[PDB]
Amino acid sequence: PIVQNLQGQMVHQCISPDTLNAWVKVVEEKAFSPEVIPMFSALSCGATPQDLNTMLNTVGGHQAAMQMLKETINEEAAEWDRLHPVHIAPGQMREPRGSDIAGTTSTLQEQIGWMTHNPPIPVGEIYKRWIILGLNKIVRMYSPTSILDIRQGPKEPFRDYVDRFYKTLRAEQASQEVKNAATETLLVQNANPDCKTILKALGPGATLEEMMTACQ
Amino acid sequence: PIVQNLQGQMVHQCISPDTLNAWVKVVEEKAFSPEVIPMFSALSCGATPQDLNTMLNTVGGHQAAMQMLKETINEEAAEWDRLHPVHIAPGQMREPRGSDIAGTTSTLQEQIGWMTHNPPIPVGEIYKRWIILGLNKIVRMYSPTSILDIRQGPKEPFRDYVDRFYKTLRAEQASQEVKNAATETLLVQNANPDCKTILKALGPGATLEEMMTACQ
Amino acid sequence: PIVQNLQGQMVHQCISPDTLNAWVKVVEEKAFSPEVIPMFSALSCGATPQDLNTMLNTVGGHQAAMQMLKETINEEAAEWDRLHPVHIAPGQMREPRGSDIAGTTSTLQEQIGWMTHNPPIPVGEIYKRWIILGLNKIVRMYSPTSILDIRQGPKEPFRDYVDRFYKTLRAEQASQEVKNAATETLLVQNANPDCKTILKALGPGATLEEMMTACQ
Amino acid sequence: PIVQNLQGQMVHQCISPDTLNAWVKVVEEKAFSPEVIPMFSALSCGATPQDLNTMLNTVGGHQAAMQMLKETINEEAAEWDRLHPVHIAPGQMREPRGSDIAGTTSTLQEQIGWMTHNPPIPVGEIYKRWIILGLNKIVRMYSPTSILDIRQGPKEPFRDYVDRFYKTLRAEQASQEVKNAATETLLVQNANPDCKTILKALGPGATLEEMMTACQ
Amino acid sequence: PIVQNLQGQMVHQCISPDTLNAWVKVVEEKAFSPEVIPMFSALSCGATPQDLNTMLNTVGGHQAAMQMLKETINEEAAEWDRLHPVHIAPGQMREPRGSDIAGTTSTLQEQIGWMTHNPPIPVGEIYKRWIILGLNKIVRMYSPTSILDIRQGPKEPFRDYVDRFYKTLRAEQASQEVKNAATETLLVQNANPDCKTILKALGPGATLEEMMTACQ
Amino acid sequence: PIVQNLQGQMVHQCISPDTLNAWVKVVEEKAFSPEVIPMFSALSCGATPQDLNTMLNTVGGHQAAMQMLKETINEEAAEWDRLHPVHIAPGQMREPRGSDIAGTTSTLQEQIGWMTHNPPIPVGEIYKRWIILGLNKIVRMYSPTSILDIRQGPKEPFRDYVDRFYKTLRAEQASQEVKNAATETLLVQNANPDCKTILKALGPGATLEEMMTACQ
């Protein structure tokens, strides 16, 4: 990645063995559970396009997902090229094309040049945005359950049902507003008869905390 | 997080793989036992709002708790906006709204600008305060036992009973004064007959050490 | 903690995930065996009062011990206040009270101010002293055996008996002089008949090495 | 490897125990699965020829593969010598031959001299290129299955078949274009009758995402 | 320990959690096998007397050995005091007594003052010398076997016998010269009849390599 | 070891706990398999003679091998003394004898003086050369199989036979030329009848890759 040294300068630093192993192990253990995306984003802080490709390429399994990710990257690259056409002056910085942002046709030195320019052309952040769009699509595709099928069991603690409900909603990746709206609507409808009766009596505008206390 | 470099300057540094893994594993192993809060606070030393969201977002389970935390954050954000209304000068620092402190509508660069300003607007510390308020509520909600049900078993060593008593009191999160007051009151009443007789004979003003020695 | 940077300046540094985990695991594995105290002291080198509270607060179990520690800290704080009364000048350093040394009513910045002052008011070292006094009391309380009950078994190797003897003496925390004096007195009396006869024949002034060789 | 210090200078640094262990363990666990190549490239960032030989020499097993790699390196070295003949001025930098790039007849100091020259003669990057050519050949040789034998089982989830298909294609190392072309051709032909009927109905130009959704 | 910073200055640095854990685990796993001494010496590189006491005090078991070590330290301290009598000028460095070198009556700051003086009074190196003398005595005491009882079994590979022979000799801690002399004398006499006949035929001046090849 | 700091100066640095543990564990797990030598060389990058002795002395087992290594070191030391006789000027650097290079009669400060001199007298690199000569002899001695006994089993995959063949050749440590020559000679002769017939038909000058493909 590109980090700050002590004369305040932005310099390249090798991706660390700790970072590499952390990402490989997170994919092995969590596959494409939603929390893998924020872990990817944190582990790739300051990454060049080369670093991002390294992280993705070091994944051994899940090649269906990785092929879908390549399709998404290429689509985002194509839209980049449409909005930002390109074309060389001796010793001058050229403009990155989509494939340069994705690190396929650009060199590490070109990537460092763009990222450390004034003003910086943040090819790492742009590429990471495309990758996260792709991973989100994979997370949704690999979501095992529809929120419509998350219903509280007759003897299931309300807390465990709510955990399942919002876990599913996260993989299904509804908005943060919908997740705030299902509290008074779908969460109540999918509760079991005993808790539903209690939740109905709480009235409108009950917080999640109040609902969970009531059915505790 | 934001740390000091060697020309004494406050600079951004990537959240480390060690920090990320430590938090994920602490939640997996301890869930919302009370000691998780001071671990969270220590692991997030110097954190930006982005770093705090990373830590919370990397948690895979417990989505009922994480949704309750979002509600608490939004409430604290709303109170921030009520006390601190907002509203742009070219190239000047704008004032953070509640959602900016929570890192949802602010960029990393804006967060760094506020935290490293003179005087600093410590959006990381403000947001961490809101998160800890939320986690405390979760710790209390997930406390499995009332202190009224912690009673010494007929053959239970007094030390083991006291461990259970103050463990429960901590999750129930009574004040630090009440924890000092239950020593002469509820701790004695919930002891078994044999130790209670001994504790009654010690008289008023006995320290916890003296009570534990007496019933040892 | 507070450490030295390269322009020779004393600066604050975040407590590391390694340090935090090491302490948590040492308590989990060793509880309050005597060797935990020197480990605590080493892991808290340079600690602020905040860091010391973090270490103590991250302990999940043993809440009877942690409550006893709080009592000891409050007693030491009260004695501090009696010897050092307090009381504000704009922008000037105030004097720490007992609760400020214990980090309950002082901020991190105040703690850094005191510790890095010229001359420094070492609130971290003062607080650590109080904590160690408390931990010592806990180690003694949780010592499972009196030295009077450590007696060599008829077939127990002398080395194993001596290990048990000085292990118990350490938890019972006799002086370093008494530990040097029991060599010729209690260690011999509690040996088994066969070794005792040999030890009696060595005469006065025998070293531990000589006694262990003789009964080997 | 060669890294940047703080006066901006390119200096040699010892290969770290973390790097050494990571590579040894990656070979032990993954053998020559395709993802081992990008891990090798990332772990050898900035490596001198000495460092590259260290990494290869620390591998204990797989000596058939390592002997094949030596053959490939020697072939690339021979082509280097053909394109770049060589031949000494007192205290002047000599030109590297193939065996010097491979680190067999060059010293560490000569390697540092070339890599840190202005302009740099990047013997580490040149040698790494030769090694990766060799590893690719090994990955292909050790690929256990032809893509022609990857056919969806009657009850095999389409996702699992696609994982196997592109995993095999990766080891077989078809182009990135062919991997984009097999989506509409071989992937459909090797699907089971039920999914094939669905995929045929999607029509031409279907994305991998659309095909996987259709057969989900 | 005391280490060099970048303005070339000798400064104190906290003992690291890695160092602390490494020593504790080496004692737990190896007890007082001879190789523990060089590990102790390496882990305590640059240590102050405080650091050395920390390492010794963090050991939980083996209190018979640790008490013997204290006796040896006190003996060496007494000899120090006899050779180097002591006795204060305001703000001047006093001379260390034996107990100051052992870190019992000296402060960390006094220790740093002596170690970083010009010329340095290396109290850490002096104390480490005393500790190693004590550990050597313990290693010898805890040596389980006399070299006289190491005899090659009728079917024992010569290599395994030689491993046992020099392992025992190391714990018994004969000189490095004796270990070179037993090659032609005791090593042959304690071999089994079949190898002894072969070794006798090699003649005088045979190297260990030649003896091991002959009986292989 | 001796490393570069930031004013470009060669300074001593303590051997790290990571390095120490890595070497100890490599010997425990791999004994004297050939790949242990390049691991030793990499882990001892920049080592002083003291560091090299530390690494060798921390090995607990294999004392027959370590005694053979001492013999080899002494032989190389004797040859050093024969080629480089020695013999003192006040405050001047003396010339190292064989035992000084091996770190037995030299101090750390003398070692640092020689290694950081201009021009440097690289006692660490010279001593490491002697140690590697000794380890190579041990690797050969402990090689369990002659290459003459590595023959392909009737049903053994050719790849597995070639792995065994070059693994044995490596321990037997034939030249790198012989390893290139056995490809067309001994590798074919020791193959099983079925593969041998195929290999004979390939003709002269077949590469290892071609032979392995043919018998795959």
Query: Dihedrals φ, ψ of B133, to 5°?
Result: -55, -45
CB contact, 8 Å: A31 with chain D? no
Q: Count other Cβ atoms within 10 Å, centred on residue F207.
A: 15
Judge: E38–F53 Cβ closer than 8 Å, yes or no: yes
- One-letter identity of residue E107: T
Q: How far is D201 from chain A (nearest CA, A)?
A: 20
Tell me if the bond preceding D119 is cis, omega within 30° of 0: yes
Q: How far is D181 from chain A (nearest CA, A)?
A: 12
CB contact, 8 Å: A99 with chain D? no
Chains meeting D at 3+ CB pairs closer than 8 A? Answer: A, F
* Tokens read off for A119: 């003003």
Beta carbons of D2 and D123 less than 8 angstroms apart = no
Return the half-sphere exposure (C-beta side, CA atoms, 13 A cut-off) of residue C62: 23
Query: Dihedrals φ, ψ of F84, to 5°?
Result: -135, 75
Beta carbons of B20 and B58 less than 8 angstroms apart = yes
Interface E-F: count of C-beta contacts within 8 A: 83
Beta carbons of D94 and D86 less than 8 angstroms apart = yes
Mind giving me the DSSP string for A59-85? --S-HHHHHHHHHHHHHHHHHHHHHS-
Buried b (16+ CB within 10 A) or exposed e, B118-155: eeebebbebbbebbbebbebbbebbbeeebeebebeee
Beta carbons of D146 and A51 less than 8 angstroms apart = no
CB contact, 8 Å: D4 with chain A? yes
- One-letter identity of residue F170: R
Q: Backbone breaks in chain A (C–N > 2.5 Å) follow which residues?
A: 87
Strands (E), chain D: 2-4, 10-12
The Cα D114–Cα D92 span in angstroms is 11
Question: What residues contact D109, with CB distance under 8 A and at least 6 apart?
Answer: none
Chains meeting C at 3+ CB pairs closer than 8 A? Answer: B, E
Judge: C8–E6 Cβ closer than 8 Å, yes or no: no
The candidate with the shortest Cα–Cα distance to F80, out of F99, F53, F55, is: F99
Boundaries of domain holding B95: 2-142
* Tokens read off for C41: 């002291």
DSSP bridge pairs for B10: B4
* Tokens read off for D135: 């590893």
CB contact, 8 Å: D7 with chain F? yes
Tell me if the bond preceding B96 is cis, omega within 30° of 0: no
Q: Backbone breaks in chain E (C–N > 2.5 Å) follow which residues?
A: 87
CB contact, 8 Å: F6 with chain E? yes
* Tokens read off for F214: 């043919």
Locus of tokens 């260290």: D54
Which stretch of DSSP H or E encloses residue B11? Answer: strand B10-12
The Cα A175–Cα D210 span in angstroms is 23
Locus of tokens 């003996």: E75
Instruction: Please tell me the experimental approach by which this structure was elucidated.
Output: X-ray
Chains F and E touch (3+ CB pairs under 8 A): yes
Judge: D64–F34 Cβ closer than 8 Å, yes or no: no
The Cα E96–Cα E143 span in angstroms is 35
CB contact, 8 Å: D133 with chain A? no
Beta carbons of B99 and B161 less than 8 angstroms apart = no
Minimal Cα distance from F36: which residue of D?
D58
Mind giving me the DSSP string for A86-154? ----TT-PPPPPHHHHTTSSS-HHHHHHHHTSSS---HHHHHHHHHHHHHHHHHHHT----GGG----T
CB contact, 8 Å: E105 with chain C? no
Query: Dihedrals φ, ψ of E128, to 5°?
Result: -60, -40
DSSP bridge pairs for F10: F4
Buried b (16+ CB within 10 A) or exposed e, F166-201: bbbbbbbbbeeeebeebbbebbbebbbeebbebbee
Q: Count other Cβ atoms within 10 Å, centred on residue C105.
A: 12
Angle between helical axes of E49-57 and E17-30 (0-180°, round to 10): 50
CB contact, 8 Å: A73 with chain B? no
Q: For chain A, first and last CA: distance in Å?
A: 48
A37-A41-A47-A52 Cα dihedral, nearest 10 degrees: 0
The Cα F47–Cα F42 span in angstroms is 10
Q: For chain B, first and last CA: distance in Å?
A: 48
* Tokens read off for C32: 């309050």
Beta carbons of C195 and C187 less than 8 angstroms apart = no
Angle between helical axes of B49-57 and A36-43 (0-180°, round to 10): 140
The candidate with the shortest Cα–Cα distance to C147, out of C170, C167, C168, C173, is: C168
Mind giving me the DSSP string for C126-190? HHHHHHHHHHHHHHHHT----GGG----TT--HHHHHHHHHHHHHHHT--HHHHHHTTTTHHHHT
Judge: C62–B163 Cβ closer than 8 Å, yes or no: yes
Judge: E167–F20 Cβ closer than 8 Å, yes or no: no
The Cα D8–Cα E112 span in angstroms is 33
The Cα B176–Cα C24 span in angstroms is 22
CB contact, 8 Å: E167 with chain C? no
Buried b (16+ CB within 10 A) or exposed e, F19-44: bbbbbbebbeeeebbbbbbbbbbbbb
Q: Count other Cβ atoms within 10 Å, centred on residue D132.
A: 16
Number of H helices, E strands in chain E: 12, 2
CA distances from E192 to A111, E163, E204, E208 (A): 70, 15, 19, 16
Strands (E), D61-148: none
Q: Count other Cβ atoms within 10 Å, centred on residue B176.
A: 11
Return the half-sphere exposure (C-beta side, CA atoms, 13 A cut-off) of residue F89: 5
Interface A-D: count of C-beta contacts within 8 A: 83
CATH classification of the domain holding A49: 1.10.375.10
Beta carbons of B187 and B178 less than 8 angstroms apart = no
Buried b (16+ CB within 10 A) or exposed e, B53-87: bbbbbbbbebbbbbbbbbbbbbebbeebeeeeeee
Chains A and B touch (3+ CB pairs under 8 A): yes
CB contact, 8 Å: F9 with chain E? yes
Beta carbons of C58 and C24 less than 8 angstroms apart = yes
Minimal Cα distance from E138: which residue of C?
C209
Chains meeting F at 3+ CB pairs closer than 8 A? Answer: D, E
The Cα F104–Cα F98 span in angstroms is 9
CB contact, 8 Å: C11 with chain E? no
* Tokens read off for C124: 């971290």
Mind giving me the DSSP string for E122-137? -HHHHHHHHHHHHHHH
Strand, helix or coil at C87?
coil
The Cα B58–Cα B19 span in angstroms is 12
Judge: B66–A166 Cβ closer than 8 Å, yes or no: yes
The Cα C54–Cα C23 span in angstroms is 10
Locus of tokens 């305590």: E44
